[PDB]
Assembly symmetry: C3
Homo-oligomer: 273 residues x 3
Amino acid sequence: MDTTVPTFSLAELQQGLHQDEFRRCLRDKGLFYLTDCGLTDTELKSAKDIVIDFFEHGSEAEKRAVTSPVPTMRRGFTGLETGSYSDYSMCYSMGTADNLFPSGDFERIWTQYFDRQYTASRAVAREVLRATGTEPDGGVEAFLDCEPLLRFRYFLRMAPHYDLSMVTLIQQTFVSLQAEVGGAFTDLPYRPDAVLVFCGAIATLVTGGQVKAPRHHVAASQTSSVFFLRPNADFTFSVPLARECGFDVSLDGETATFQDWIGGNYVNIRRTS
Amino acid sequence: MDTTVPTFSLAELQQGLHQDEFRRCLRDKGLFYLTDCGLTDTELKSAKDIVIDFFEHGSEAEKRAVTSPVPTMRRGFTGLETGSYSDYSMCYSMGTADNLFPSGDFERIWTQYFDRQYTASRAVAREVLRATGTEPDGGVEAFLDCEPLLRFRYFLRMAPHYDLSMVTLIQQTFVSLQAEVGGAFTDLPYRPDAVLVFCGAIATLVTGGQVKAPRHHVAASQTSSVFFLRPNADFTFSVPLARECGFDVSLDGETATFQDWIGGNYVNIRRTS
Amino acid sequence: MDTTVPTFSLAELQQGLHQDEFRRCLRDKGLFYLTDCGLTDTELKSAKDIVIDFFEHGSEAEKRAVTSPVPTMRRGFTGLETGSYSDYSMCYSMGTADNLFPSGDFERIWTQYFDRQYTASRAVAREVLRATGTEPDGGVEAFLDCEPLLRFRYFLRMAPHYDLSMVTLIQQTFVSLQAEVGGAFTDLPYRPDAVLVFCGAIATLVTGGQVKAPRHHVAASQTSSVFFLRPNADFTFSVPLARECGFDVSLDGETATFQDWIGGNYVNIRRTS
Ligand SMILES: CC(C)CC(=O)C(=O)O
Ligand SMILES: CC(C)CC(=O)C(=O)O
Ligand SMILES: CC(C)CC(=O)C(=O)O
Ligand SMILES: [Fe+2]
Ligand SMILES: [Fe+2]
Ligand SMILES: [Fe+2]
């Protein structure tokens, strides 16, 4: 089997092309680059510049006003680890609501950036479901109108793990990002013309094991954008089916919700260790 | 903004003094020293000496008799990490009930030590609620008659994290303890005349985001007393409100309990990493 | 007290012999070697050879076909951590159903290997319950017809922790495995004639604190078989009783289930740190 990370045009997928190839990719690899999805280096420049300017020239008062009282990295500014937790790296997060913006121009640029990412993530997830003939409990659209989280970081840096999202979209700017493909770590360089997609555990779950959730990590001067498309707490699934594809669930009953499985706080990643 | 860790007299707070300053501290820093709360180096000496004597002269049989069958560090003696888990450090824990005491004198000294700590923690938490005009679901006293945990350790030693308590009271004896203040790690030396207070995530939650829960850590021959004031499993709060201040909750419904959020086992700290 | 790890014959236990010694072992140590349980180096050779052959000569296609879409190490092949997650070590897991076998001969050999392990684990757990006069809520057999997990690994390697199983059976092949006995790490060498047993937190819980769940770790060219006997999600227990023996539960009510306590996903180990 080719260990190459494939590339798919969203437009072409939406037209019913390369369905067999798409299915094989999802099953055997669970990751691919996506083009023609409305996201390129162009849309990124604007957001990167404005936020980077903030991480460098924003004062403490300005950062404080956009910092959550709890360091959860859910909304606003965060200094992630004498000195400051910023020494290692800084982060900016946002979602569909309850955001913290430092200025008007920043808000406009990022609200639009977030929207393109959300639209693209929903679109590719929609094709993931169609290619596997998957109809989530409660319908496709209700499943896709969910709880996304966008994190932008600015600098092994990150330990091996898999994501618990439906799908995760990544934009980057030495190749630090590595993913397991064909039983070996493969480089995942930047593609100014595309976004990198990682399938998460929820894709595996909802499709009944038809999609792989690949492990990946970061080796150790770069910025990355990570968009997690996460289901709603009440997303419902079959317990026996989860067991049939690898989930070591401790759930009584025939059906369960995302909340029942993961708990009352979103968990984005999981280390196999 | 001054990055100095302020000091407040409990007596003065209870009299309605420095309310504006207290509010600013809670919001911008989430930590402060507390005086006139009935806890000083005096009350500590007695407890420290008796337990330290145990950690050094107590036999294996004596330690075994006050050691829980599961190494949870909830009650009794614990050797925390050829050799012994004690090599790194030893710990002694207690709560309102189900305690394990090695002797009568030890019991008397520690029951009184625990009580002063619990009274002080409840008292400062009571002022935290009043300063922010917070009325917990079910009332103030029911909220404060909770599930505290006292841990005494004897020796980065501890990774950056924030506490999930309402408030945490610390007594100490090179400044190892560092906390993030104004975007920088600040030393938190010992004050024989006061107790150091850290606001936890529950303070942030119950007050609707009016209190910061500061991150902190320990850099690497000292003993420290840590008292966590923790809510009851049935403490209830508004889901939309939790989201409004940073909590990345995966909870269906308008209201939820501490148990719904954290799970069936108390979790005292959380690393932002 | 002797810090020696005792050995017990399953046959002799089932006949009512050494009951006082067994009780003392469970309470003070929580670990022991077990003989006459139907498991020796003989039964192991067959399974070890066939799987080891796979880890070395099996192609990527063959490994892929027995690899779960999510890297949970619940069923099938797993490469556990330029290179591959296999570099560190490889693993093969199985349970009562939903298994992934690479060949017919492999299936026969391992289905029988798993069965002997499950029978032995249930048998010793049955004696653990009888020696402590324990009658689980819902009866002994319903409690023992549970959710076991068998993991076979092929290479500190593993950090200090205790197991959350009822009991855990280990077969091994320099002594890497160390356990805390009498307040000191003790070697746990291989015994071709016996299986090593570790009591888990569930044994402590169901017996009301009569059984210790010992901490252990691995120091750093060997293979080990680990069989966790895990309760069903609906296993029910008394909340006040759990508190009486060390469990820091955040559970409202008088009774709770394993699922209520641990969550919707099995958790096999826990680090005291
Ligand atoms: C390598 C980056 C995309 C970070 C990542 O994988 C994550 O945040 O889950
Ligand atoms: C620095 C000590 C007070 C330990 C601590 O922060 C904790 O136990 O949460
Ligand atoms: C030392 C081995 C038996 C591994 C282990 O303890 C475990 O998997 O829980
Ligand atoms: Fe990831
Ligand atoms: Fe802390
Ligand atoms: Fe273990």
